[PDB]
């Protein structure tokens, strides 16, 4: 679990979105596993606008933050689930690090601010859904 709160927006993994998220829907993209909903309070997370390939993520299954090197956003195939058939997930970055189902939603940050949220993993790998291209989150 976990979300990004920026301005009047809440960004979450689409497979974990609530009834409230869907009732207050701004935008969603199944291929990115992202959903954005509107909020009543002002969010203060800063979104990074960069091409960093290093950062720190929060890993709930370890109650710890870990430093990581991560790949550039790309199409990476993925397997099924209560959520989505076999498929390519776009705007996805991979890193060598611990993740288990339950870690989805943990924030990845670089010196510039929020980069994305944990989405996918397994085998000593962890994936992050990038949010740095969603320029509209700021305005
Ligand atoms: C951190 S998730 C993880 C980690 C280790 C092992 C397994 C998982 C689970 C996982 O990869 N998925 C199930 C939930 C939806 C999913 F995140 C997606 N974006 O399609 C795929
Ligand atoms: Zn950065």
């Amino acid at each position: 679990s976990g979300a990004i709160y920026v301005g009047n927006y809440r960004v979450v993994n689409r497979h974990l979105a609530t009834h409230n998220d869907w009732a207050n829907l701004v935008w969603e993209d199944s291929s990115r596993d992202l959903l954005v909903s509107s909020t009543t309070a002002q969010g203060c997370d800063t979104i990074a606008r960069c091409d960093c390939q290093t950062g720190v993520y929060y890993c709930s299954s370890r109650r710890k933050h870990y430093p990581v090197s991560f790949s550039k956003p790309s199409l990476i195939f993925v397997e099924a689930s209560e959520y989505y058939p076999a498929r390519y997930q776009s705007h996805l970055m991979l890193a060598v690090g611990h993740s288990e189902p339950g870690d989805c939603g943990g924030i990845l940050r670089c010196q510039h601010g929020v980069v994305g949220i944990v989405s996918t993993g397994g085998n000593g790998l962890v994936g992050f859904a990038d949010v740095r291209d969603l320029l509209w989150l700021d305005e």
Side-chain angles (χ1 to χ4, degrees):
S1 59
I4 304 159
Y5 290 98
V6 51
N8 300 325
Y9 297 130
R10 163 178 143 100
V11 190
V12 285
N13 296 84
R14 191 196 183 272
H15 74 281
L16 295 182
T18 73
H19 292 286
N20 208 48
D21 287 328
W22 273 104
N24 287 307
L25 179 60
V26 170
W27 164 86
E28 51 78 27
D29 188 330
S30 192
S31 75
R32 297 177 65 153
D33 182 38
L34 290 178
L35 179 146
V36 179
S37 62
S38 54
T39 71
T40 63
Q42 165 90 358
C44 296
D45 287 333
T46 276
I47 311 297
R49 296 306 178 197
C50 63
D51 76 351
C52 283
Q53 277 186 253
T54 71
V56 174
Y57 78 106
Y58 181 67
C59 170
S60 57
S61 65
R62 287 293 183 273
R63 273 192 213 124
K64 264 177 168 97
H65 296 256
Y66 289 106
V68 285
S69 291
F70 55 88
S71 66
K72 305 200 99 110
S74 62
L75 271 177
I76 292 154
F77 171 78
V78 167
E79 280 226 68
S81 49
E82 358 53 67
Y83 338 108
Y84 307 109
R87 95 234 202 264
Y88 289 90
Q89 180 164 313
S90 62
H91 297 268
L92 180 61
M93 302 170 296
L94 294 187
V96 175
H98 177 72
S99 66
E100 294 167 33
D103 281 330
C104 289
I107 283 170
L108 170 62
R109 293 179 76 91
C110 63
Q111 64 188 105
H112 310 98
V114 176
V115 173
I117 50 167
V118 176
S119 173
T120 85
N123 303 315
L125 297 169
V126 51
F128 306 103
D130 188 48
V131 304
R132 298 178 286 186
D133 62 317
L134 308 176
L135 313 188
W136 52 268
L137 292 177
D138 285 323
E139 55 237 27

